[PDB]
């Protein structure tokens, strides 16, 4: 319920503000009147080194609920990216992003963000969120690389 979630949300920001992976960006939305909405974060994840995603800064929106931290914070890419584990709506799919699956209330936002970056390199073939990407990735790795490479350069901080 409310209050509880906000207490943990503030804790996450405190921990993240202290220590966080270099290149990763995460901060709650600045609600008008000098306030802040801890239930809505604007995070950004850069491409992992050694991958065709390297160089691109992908931004996503982290949506929180009142059931937090019991409920997982659904993250939607802004805008959605070409990835078989990312729905055209922007909804990212991950085992630890579902309570009934591998999500644990003790999971820090840091672990979630890192997991998303990892997913970019190693796509889950069990979750065909993006039919287009899934098909291309499965039958033509070359054509997939091209689209991913152009994507990184497209979202590259200029």
């Amino acid at each position: 319920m409310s209050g509880i979630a906000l207490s943990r949300l503030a804790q996450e920001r405190k921990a993240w503000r202290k220590d966080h992976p270099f290149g990763f960006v995460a901060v709650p939305t600045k609600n008008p009147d000098g306030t802040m909405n801890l239930m809505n974060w604007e995070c950004a994840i850069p491409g992992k080194k050694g991958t065709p995603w390297e160089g691109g800064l992908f931004k996503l929106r982290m949506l929180f609920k009142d059931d937090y931290p019991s409920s997982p914070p659904k993250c939607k890419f802004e805008p959605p990216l070409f990835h078989p584990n990312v729905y055209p709506s922007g909804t990212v799919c991950l085992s630890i992003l579902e309570e009934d699956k591998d999500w644990r209330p003790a999971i820090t936002i840091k672990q979630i963000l890192l997991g998303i970056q990892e997913l970019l390199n190693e796509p889950n073939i069990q979750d065909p969120a993006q039919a287009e990407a899934y098909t291309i990735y499965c039958q033509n790795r070359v054509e997939y690389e091209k689209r991913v490479r152009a994507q990184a350069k497209k979202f590259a901080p200029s």
Partner: protein, 217 residues
């Protein structure tokens, strides 16, 4: 940067020796340390060829917000219940688990499938001469660089469990021991477990010193 080790290839088929060692590292943590959900050591019941994919949003006639226990398996519970018995644990991971894993024939269509090893069969070595357990293979050089046999790692694995169990008990209940590379017991455990796991997949065994260097990295 270091390469990530996916739980799939760790729990399923570890084609690389280093993977068998990483598996053993998680094994220690899931027995005397921190218990994780994805970083478990037990065979997954939600395997794509067993139950679901499992793709986003479950597919069952039950409450999704009230899962029974499809993804909350805790090997630590069984270990604690058995009082950390070497035989029970050995016959579980190295005899029953891979046997259940063999059910997934889709995993063995090119790679040689694993062979289950029983505690009694390893004690009564039939593959080789069941000579003195103390020392049968005469070698020279670093003692820690001498690759032991399956019997050695089996009994060694059993002995490490003993010292680790009493070590945890000394800390009390609800305690969690973190794995280290300087602790003889913790190192012996990971070394034996890894060697046993790799031996099951017909992979060349490694020495304690060799593993110690990569286990701690």
């Amino acid at each position: 940067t270091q390469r990530t080790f996916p739980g799939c290839t760790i729990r399923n088929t570890p084609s690389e020796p280093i993977h068998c060692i990483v598996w053993a590292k998680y094994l220690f943590n899931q027995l005397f340390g921190e218990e994780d959900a994805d970083q478990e050591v037990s065979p997954d019941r939600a395997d794509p060829e067993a139950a679901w994919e499992p793709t986003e949003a479950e597919a069952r006639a039950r409450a999704s917000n009230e899962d029974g226990d499809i993804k909350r398996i805790s090997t630590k519970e069984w270990a604690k219940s058995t009082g950390y018995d070497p035989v029970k644990l050995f016959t579980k991971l190295f005899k029953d688990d891979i046997r259940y894993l063999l059910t997934m024939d889709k995993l063995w269509r090119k790679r040689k499938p694993p062979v289950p090893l029983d505690w009694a069969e390893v004690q009564s070595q039939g593959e080789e001469t069941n000579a003195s357990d103390q020392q049968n293979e005469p070698q020279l050089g670093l003692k820690d660089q001498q690759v032991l046999d399956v019997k050695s790692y089996a009994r060694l694995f059993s002995k490490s469990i003993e010292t680790l169990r009493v070590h945890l008990a000394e800390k009390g209940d609800g305690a969690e021991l973190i794995w280290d590379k300087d602790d003889p017991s913790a190192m012996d455990f990971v070394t034996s477990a890894a060697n046993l796991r790799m031996h099951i997949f017909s992979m060349n065994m490694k020495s304690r010193f060799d593993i110690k260097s990569m286990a701690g990295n």
